[PDB]
Design a protein around this nucleic acid. Structure first.
Length: 210
RNA sequence: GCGUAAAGGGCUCGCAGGCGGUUUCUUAAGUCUGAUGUGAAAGCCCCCGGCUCAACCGGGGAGGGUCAUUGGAAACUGGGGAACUUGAGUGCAGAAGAGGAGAGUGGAAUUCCACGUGUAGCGGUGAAAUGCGUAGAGAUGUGGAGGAACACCAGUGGCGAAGGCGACUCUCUGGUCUGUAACUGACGCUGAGGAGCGAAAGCGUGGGGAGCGAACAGGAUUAGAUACCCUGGUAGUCCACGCCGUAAACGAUGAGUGCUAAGUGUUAGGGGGUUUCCGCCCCUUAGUGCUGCAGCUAACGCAUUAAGCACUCCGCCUGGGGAGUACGGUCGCAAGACUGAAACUCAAAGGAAUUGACGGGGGCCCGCACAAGCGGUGGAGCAUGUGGUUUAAUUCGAAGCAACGCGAAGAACCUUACCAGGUCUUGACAUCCUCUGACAAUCCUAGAGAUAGGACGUCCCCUUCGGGGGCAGAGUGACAGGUGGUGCAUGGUUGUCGUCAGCUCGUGUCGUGAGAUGUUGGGUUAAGUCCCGCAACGAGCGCAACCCUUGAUCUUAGUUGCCAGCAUUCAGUUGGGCACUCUAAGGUGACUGCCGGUGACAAACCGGAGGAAGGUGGGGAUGACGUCAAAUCAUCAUGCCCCUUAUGACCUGGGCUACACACGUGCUACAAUGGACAGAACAAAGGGCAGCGAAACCGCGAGGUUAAGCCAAUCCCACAAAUCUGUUCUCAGUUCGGAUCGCAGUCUGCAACUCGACUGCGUGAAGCUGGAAUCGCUAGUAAUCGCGGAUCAGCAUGCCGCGGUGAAUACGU
């Protein structure tokens, strides 16, 4: 029985360590600090869809370089909400963290925003074939080597085993030098927690040196 | 409609009946048409009118007959007469056969008998036994008797209506086909009843009984053997005379006739092309076998021997069970045969084809699977988990591998859910409304404690008063809670099948379809790996590689690490040095690269050099769609149900550790390759600031004291142990082994009695290599000797890594 973290399988060999920091006589305040800031943007992203939240430890000041799909949706009205939740995070963890911003375009190349946004886009009464084919057409048509999205579990109520992993194109699932983006989310409708998991293997980088 | 679904009669001969070659004259009996009669009304239909329309009524029509009487046509069926010849028959000449009936004869072989020869077994089987044999068997030699069947020719050969028919000869007899073509002139085809034949089993009588052989006897195999097997053995098989009249009586296909692609056999003939011959070849019949066009079909398949295409006639079929049963008849000596229902009940039986599964079916292959060796387990004491029994509770979860040294990477209290007791009910944790306050702390008492009372105590960062702001308290319900139930509501996650090599799709084609094809065939690999053919062409996940580690180096770079080359000591320790070792970055290096071949050239495969390393170098990470409603609501989250002044919350003590018993995985032993000591030598890896702890002294001892140093390639943990050199134990429950249990200490903690370990003295169970059975293992492997670490105050015989000693075997499927 196998299944593997694609996002942890390729991490550190071709993928990047999403949490950077020095370490450290006290790794505990770093670990819980990064989890708590990950839930800080996690709570502050009910409608922004920040597809990654990198925080950097910088000698008594965090550099929480929060990425975002749309810039001004979390970037505030020209500096209002970003300074507000930023300073509020400064009095939320204890370190005055000058949180930067990021503009993630190409939503078919963003894993958690496109898949999780497909899931909440399914939570509004959207069907399994309509949600999966619709995400395969928007993000599946957006440009990538292959995106395969499936919403596995409760959908339709009874006889709960439902695995429609509808997705096409090539997939470096076992190609260890592929560097695919593959993260899932969890939608919680009225029938039950019937979440979705999809990855979009955009393309590998050829190894070289000089 | 009838080859396989229900349905071809077992087969023939025939009366009645049903159907019938071509020409020609008549006939109207059918066939068809015209005229009259009659088929009443009401009704159906068409066309109008009347009740406001409609239903309805009325009027006007139509249509309805093997209908009569009667007039025509003569094409077709028929009546009658004349004809003709291929149909069918006779003739003439050929050919052929296990066609039949009766009689006679012949061998090969078995049994039995008589006698010679000879000894101790013969026989049978999977292995044996029953049985036979010293009373002379088997075998072998000779001779005799009797029955039954005829080997070789012999063959999807021949003949027959079918069942069937085989040594050879004779009598009597039927039939088939060929050939011209003398005659006859449709004299034919089918045919319900009726008649007749019909394997083998049976049935009656009388013969015959050599082999075979139900029932029966014995022995074997099995838990059982009224069976399979073996040794015997009655009826029967054989004959003649009579009855039986069933079969998968099969080609599961009734008979007759006409037509419709082809090839290739094979008998029985004929004509012929040259051929004395012979022989080849064509044409031709008749019969029979294969391969196939059209066509048929549900598919398999049939296909000039149709299941095609049409005609004649007979028989059979109307879902399955009930049930070919009952009842009634006919026949039978019987056994039974023919004929042959029903009540109830069910929505399926059934035919073909596909996908998968199965197989104690076959084929090919692989893997510690088996074989080959090593070392174990199951035997002993102990450690842990499970079952069970107990309990107030022995918390919940896992139950074939995949449950059992599992969650547990740590149970004295906490853990903890479970028990007993004392408590509180917006509550231990959170948001919200109001409301006061900065909150709280610090001691005392009572209590084992949670708590309850005091005294001591607290009494803001920002406005210009309204504040803002957490904190705490209260009300106050919205709420909060559940390690409750549902892993068959779930997400997430994880095992195994398994690193085994598969698992699918787009397009195309086939096939009415499901499906298939690719993916199969040929090799080759560990591989659906690669190559080549292929009605397929492509791609996806898998395989591989990419990643890390591991043995070879280069280059960079030398500090705490390394010390050659110099001085230096107890000490790389210290001026010195960066050669070597080592450290982590970039690379390089191995990819069938190269050579000899093998091989359908290709794929791969055998062998060799060279190199540190050779045919995926060694190892790790990586686990395909799917299976198991497999594991988890108790890591977490989550649909529903249920509890809530208690299934919630707080505290003390207990339990999770109990114990007639069975297991599961490991430890330590049973011992001389050993046991005790003395001395010496060899590692690698990781951790260490809430920490490691040097040296010094103290204590046998476990450890205590203080304290340099180390935020660590420097210092500490640290000394490795198995191993080597001497003393000695000497075969025994012991100078082996070690529990149990007692006294006596240390360390950890709020506290070691349930329940931490270690040490001292004493004690010295059981064990002398462990049953049926079962396990892991392909070389730095098994096995074995030690070290470090996660949990963690303490708590390892587990778990995860680390190094040391260093094997045997793989014949083969």
């Amino acid at each position: 029985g196998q299944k593997v973290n694609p996002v942890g399988l390729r991490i550190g060999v071709i993928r990047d360590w999403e949490s950077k920091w020095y370490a450290g006589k006290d790794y505990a305040d770093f670990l819980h600090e990064d989890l708590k800031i990950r839930e800080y943007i996690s709570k502050r992203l009910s409608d922004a869809s920040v597809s990654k939240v990198e925080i950097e430890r910088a000698a008594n000041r965090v550099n929480i370089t929060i990425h975002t799909a749309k810039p001004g949706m979390v970037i505030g009205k020209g500096g209002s909400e970003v300074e507000a939740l930023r300073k509020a995070l400064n009095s939320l963890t204890g370190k005055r963290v000058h949180i930067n911003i990021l503009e993630i375009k190409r939503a078919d190349l963003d894993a958690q925003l496109v898949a999780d946004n497909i899931a909440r886009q399914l939570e509004n009464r959207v069907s399994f074939r309509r949600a999966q084919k619709q995400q395969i057409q928007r993000t599946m048509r957006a440009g990538a080597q292959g995106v395969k999205t499936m919403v596995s579990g409760r959908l339709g109520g009874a006889d709960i085993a439902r695995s429609e992993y509808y997705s096409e194109g090539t997939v470096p699932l076992h190609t260890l030098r592929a560097d695919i983006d593959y993260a899932t989310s969890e939608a919680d409708t009225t029938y039950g927690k019937l979440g979705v998991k999809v990855w979009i293997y955009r393309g590998e980088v050829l190894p070289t040196k000089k």
